């Protein structure tokens, strides 16, 4: 299992283009699973797991 580092809140919406992407709505809570890169995070939301830009979320 992937432990949840912390939760973040989406400040901007984001639509997933492929299966590696995590999409979400503005206001969704996201469970961060990996601090991938300077600009990318891996997380879970609504059963889905994927990566997304760090600049779309703020700490929960």
């Amino acid at each position: 299992g992937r432990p949840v580092l912390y939760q973040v809140v989406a400040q901007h919406s984001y639509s997933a283009q492929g299966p590696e992407d995590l999409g979400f709505r503005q206001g969704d809570t996201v469970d961060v699973l990996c601090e991938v890169d300077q600009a990318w995070l891996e997380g879970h939301c609504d059963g889905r797991i994927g990566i997304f830009p760090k600049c779309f979320v703020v700490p929960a």
Side-chain angles (χ1 to χ4, degrees):
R2 328 267 314 274
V4 179
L5 285 67
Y6 45 74
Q7 287 184 317
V8 295
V9 174
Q11 176 196 338
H12 311 110
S13 279
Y14 177 67
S15 303
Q17 306 324 141
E20 80 270 39
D21 292 312
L22 172 67
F24 47 67
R25 284 171 95 283
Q26 183 176 307
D28 280 349
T29 305
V30 179
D31 297 301
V32 173
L33 301 181
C34 193
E35 298 166 316
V36 161
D37 205 17
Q38 165 161 273
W40 297 88
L41 294 173
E42 193 192 17
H44 161 273
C45 180
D46 282 348
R48 323 177 291 272
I49 288 153
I51 70 173
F52 62 91
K54 218 172 272 194
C55 63
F56 279 27
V57 302
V58 303

